[PDB]
Design a protein around this ligand. Structure first.
Ligand SMILES: NC(=O)c1ccc[n+]([C@@H]2O[C@H](COP(=O)([O-])OP(=O)(O)OC[C@H]3O[C@@H](n4cnc5c(N)ncnc54)[C@H](O)[C@@H]3O)[C@@H](O)[C@H]2O)c1
Ligand SMILES: NC(=O)c1ccc[n+]([C@@H]2O[C@H](COP(=O)([O-])OP(=O)(O)OC[C@H]3O[C@@H](n4cnc5c(N)ncnc54)[C@H](O)[C@@H]3O)[C@@H](O)[C@H]2O)c1
Ligand SMILES: NC(=O)c1ccc[n+]([C@@H]2O[C@H](COP(=O)([O-])OP(=O)(O)OC[C@H]3O[C@@H](n4cnc5c(N)ncnc54)[C@H](O)[C@@H]3O)[C@@H](O)[C@H]2O)c1
Ligand SMILES: NC(=O)c1ccc[n+]([C@@H]2O[C@H](COP(=O)([O-])OP(=O)(O)OC[C@H]3O[C@@H](n4cnc5c(N)ncnc54)[C@H](O)[C@@H]3O)[C@@H](O)[C@H]2O)c1
Ligand SMILES: [Zn+2]
Ligand SMILES: [Zn+2]
Lengths: 333, 333, 333, 334
């Protein structure tokens, strides 16, 4: 139903477009990417090293991108304010470039006649939502919002369930993260973040993440109670969260499994998964969950100190949440 | 000075052999491996994908392996009780096959005239030692001992410093670990451990490890206070420990750095290293430390709850510790 | 229609099973694999790092493996003469273990009541067939046959088309080939093929291949006119043939494209594909073609001397050919 | 260490030329320009190397200089090569290793800041191209802007010379199976002019064009028009291999090909062309300084006139050594 524009046709712009046509929960009507002409969009949309060929049709017609016979307006603008979302019929704009993450820089889309803006990344100052956690705190006053990060979308649903049932006194998270577009094939310059310039195929690379702190913004009771870090490892896609937490109430591992399984079958169905299967990362490739709890992989030292493991397709889960959030915003117009 | 036999000329058997010839701390006089004949041993020893070509000479001469002009007797026995260690002058035997890790199985080498056996792995029953942590607990009554795992040799020196200064109430460890020879190139059979059969190049693979539990054997005060798990990731060597612990006594992160750096410059020099550099895993390739604390990578939630990061060349640091243990054992005869 | 048993539940044993159920061309009724019990077969069939989760249902019921509701008898025999294929109703057996490739060993399946055996590998002595090239030379007298190799299945249909239209005077082939189950994760022992023991994640590895010579057996006119070699490289699946050949008749590259395209649309449809797209190896993951001609990647020096490039999913193309060959055999009786 | 050198672009090739200059002592590095790597960052990037390991020597920042093995190096931060003050730093020859100034007109900008000669670490549309051991004796003092060709041409040309000299190449087609490089992407991204080159370098075998076989016909004029080829990028961080399929004028038994290659490796092409019968794989050539190492066991003959010859190359380290060797040779002719 709601009509959508996508700024940046990167991993995230393309896979939100893909999630939109797959689920049919929104109608993509516009796309902007200055480094990507129309014929090149067809190619980049249709062929995907990680998720395989698009299941549907894609071609350039009359200077439109036509997916499943639905035509889409193509902008080659550098500057978001210049983009005429208005003319094209785009009510909501996904801001997927990762260089317009502030309320102000993101707000530029409103000048083209965009009603509302969803930043596909953490924002310094836009309000952050996570589907299944704090999305019901969205209302119509909000024209510039954030869907947080892939890692926050993994951690927050599990942390809600654990905190709600047992009380997280304190937590420290590690994410073992697949490589991303910001990394390098061989040792090269990354001026502010030296480790991130080191060859991505050759190395385990420690990195900072704001995801654990961000959980304290969507779950205010966990403010100041979580922090963490990442390691980048040489896999193309699918990441894993490792949450080491101290609990207020005693929680046998069997009781943790029971409350996560219950949450996955009820209110967090499609958002928080649960498995007892002997899974590895590739089993989550193109899995649309935000977070799949791995019962077998986790370990408890005692009833108050546990390490919980949850898997996430960092591309596909997040892309499907952007769509779901837009559907829920539209359902509240 | 002590003469050594190697059972299993694998990653650890070959790099123990290199470490022996590079350090001159022990003399290799015999090798057994029924799957590697003499001419094949020359090739496998000379060329190493991970650590590069041997700097020295290796040839087959008169049915012996000759390294740096030193002739080595070669055996080809599947049955360790049938190896004539005594006839070859091997006083100590490195048991590096991975299939003889109980005192009962490793004790077979005593039938062929070995005086002592060092299992290059954790043992269900052999007493376990880590250089710099409990190796002074070794005595001449022990004919069969274990040098623990690579992961225990990384965690235990760091756990020692943290416990000696602040106390560890409880800890949970993750190791992000390079692939090993037990893994498979593509999805294949691993009947007892289904995740471990999944393709090693494609997957992050969760795995059990006894390493954190074993730290409570080498540091009896931490018995029952540590446990953990592993992810295998697609790098050919170098691994990292992530230890999440609750301290008894409060420590600022700069106080932890101070006492680790002091340990690395004094009593644990060569075993525990300390860096503030922006390191990644390939920076530790062929590093002979057991453990290198990464000051920049670690994070503290508060003065009692911290995540400490330590690197280890799982092949080379361990192989150097097998040689150091045998040299220490030889000094007590 | 024909009922089929599978000896060896491996990449090819499993993907022949997946291809059978996906195409419906044959009926799998029995499987033998002494290293994969019934519950483990469920897991290994359901989850696949390369081709993703099986689309359909798989469970253990009443001691049977049940795929898409079809019950499959499970055997666990080391010794193929002891498998009771006849009692399970298996008429044709896919010998996919890699260790019974001679007619004497493969013929053991006839003692248990199989009528015909298809070896899923080259054979020293069984007659070899490639679908689209010599499958019409199969006749009802042949109880034990070979489907040749994945590489012979890529090269033979292309060579057929070039030889038919221009004549190949002489040709030399390279295959840049994905890793396989016979390779090692880290430098390890490999019998009489020392390069093949070197770490598969780290190395480009030259290997011998009979594939180009074997083309001379399925296309007798090319006997002694073709040979070649392989490089194994660190990708998990999808391989490429590079055929450098001297032609008898002049052939502009546009003429080559024309005749390959016509072959792909007609008599070799589903076997030989044709693309002008800007493809890379992952675009062929799960592609069921034997051979896809890459028009853009190849290059001509002159009208008699050309390099032709053809892609193959070494796992899925070949598996689909084993099923098609068995359906072709079944059509003769 | 006679000729004083400036390096433009402190990347894989610029850093490893610098390492090779300090190891061989053939030339003196006195200046480096890279607007994306400041002085403290150059210390880190030079000291630690994922592929070739930690630098064996000292490296530090002092008084705004990069100091390697106690030798102070002037650091510039200019995007525009005509603005670099090479002459004030004492740099006589400049290594042009950015990948973006490969024409004589663009590389000639270094002469404006007082460099005397420029060596482009890449093929050039117009600068004369040289390959050590093949046509470096054709260099003369009139040439102020030259190319050291590509890594692939430096592998194929020495082998092609030995084969052509002894048997005559009627015609040849080359494949290189090539390590990934900095121009590739970690995951599918934009590469608007060469779409395949944008696809994830860790997941894919990627076909690519290369002029390297054509180029052998510039450095070996008798092979003009007789060679072409293509590349496959594969997911390894370093070391590449050439596969040359050629038709020979004179009959060549594989044993005779081996004999004349081994003889060239021990004499006139020592250190440039290597020869092995060992059961090698790519990692055995990591940090190997040869341009080309013939793999006797990997190659195959259909007959006495039609053969596939295999040669390995460390595309980073062999090439970087050749840049230093060519500069020292140029200095000898002044
Ligand atoms: N990839 C992941 O795992 C993941 C998941 C969660 C969130 N994110 C976030 O999504 C954002 C995009 O990440 P990505 O992985 O898709 O990156 P990407 O590099 O794959 O995509 C970025 C795209 O934006 C385009 N672009 C650049 N500048 C532009 C401009 N001025 N106007 C329009 N288009 C422009 C680029 O050409 C490119 O195609 C980042 O904020 C990232 O952190 C990424
Ligand atoms: N690789 C590591 O990082 C690492 C580090 C610490 C300890 N370890 C331990 O060291 C041991 C060896 O591991 P690895 O990585 O060297 O394995 P590997 O597979 O590389 O080496 C094992 C060797 O034993 C040989 N072998 C097998 N059966 C034998 C027999 N009956 N008699 C003699 N030799 C036989 C094999 O041929 C092989 O060469 C294991 O217990 C392992 O857990 C491994
Ligand atoms: N994978 C490819 O790309 C490919 C394609 C073409 C052909 N082939 C050929 O197919 C054959 C199988 O190769 P793969 O890649 O599936 O290997 P694999 O190692 O994945 O599978 C072999 C299977 O045989 C089973 N097995 C071993 N001994 C057995 C016995 N005695 N009885 C029953 N089962 C037994 C193993 O448990 C395993 O599941 C080989 O001959 C190979 O050359 C491989
Ligand atoms: N890597 C190889 O195997 C190899 C081998 C032979 C030749 N080459 C060629 O050498 C050149 C460099 O390749 P590389 O692999 O070192 O690339 P790289 O990307 O690692 O290095 C290029 C460097 O140039 C710098 N740079 C960019 N713009 C600049 C400017 N305006 N002024 C100064 N510095 C600037 C970058 O910051 C970077 O450090 C290319 O022409 C390449 O084709 C590469
Ligand atoms: Zn036979
Ligand atoms: Zn019938």
């Amino acid at each position: 139903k709601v009509k959508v524009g996508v700024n940046g046709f990167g991993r995230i712009g393309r896979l939100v477009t893909r999630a939109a046509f797959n689920s049919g929960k929104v109608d993509i009507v516009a796309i902007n990417d200055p480094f990507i002409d129309l014929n090149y969009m067809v190619y980049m949309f249709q062929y995907d090293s990680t998720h395989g060929k698009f299941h549907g049709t894609v071609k350039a017609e009359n200077g439109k991108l036509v997916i499943n016979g639905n035509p889409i307006t193509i902008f080659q603008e550098r500057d978001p304010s210049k983009i005429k979302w208005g003319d094209a019929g785009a009510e909501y704009v996904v801001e997927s470039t990762g260089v317009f993450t502030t309320m102000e820089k993101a707000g530029a889309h409103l000048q083209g006649g965009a009603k509302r803006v969803i930043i596909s990344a953490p924002s310094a100052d836009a309000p952050m939502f996570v589907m299944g956690v704090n999305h019901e705190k969205y209302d119509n006053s909000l024209k510039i919002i954030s869907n947080a990060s892939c890692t926050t979308n993994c951690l927050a649903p599990l942390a809600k369930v654990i905190h709600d049932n047992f009380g997280i006194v304190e937590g420290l998270m590690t994410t073992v993260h697949a490589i991303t577009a910001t990394q390098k094939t061989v040792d090269g310059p990354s001026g502010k973040l030296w480790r991130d310039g080191r060859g991505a195929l050759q190395n385990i690379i420690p990195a900072s993440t704001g995801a654990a702190k961000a959980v304290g913004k969507v779950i205010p009771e966990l403010n100041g109670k979580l922090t963490g870090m990442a390691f980048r490892v040489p896999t193309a896609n699918v990441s894993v969260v490792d949450l080491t937490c101290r609990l207020e109430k005693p929680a046998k591992y069997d009781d943790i499994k029971k409350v996560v399984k219950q949450a996955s079958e009820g209110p967090l169905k499609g958002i928080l998964g649960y498995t007892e299967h002997q899974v590895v990362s590739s089993d989550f490739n193109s899995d649309t969950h935000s977070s799949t709890f791995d019962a077998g992989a986790g370990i408890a030292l005692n009833d108050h100190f546990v390490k919980l493991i949850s898997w996430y397709d960092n591309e596909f889960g997040y892309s499907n949440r952007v769509v779901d959030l837009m559907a829920h915003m539209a359902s509240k117009e």
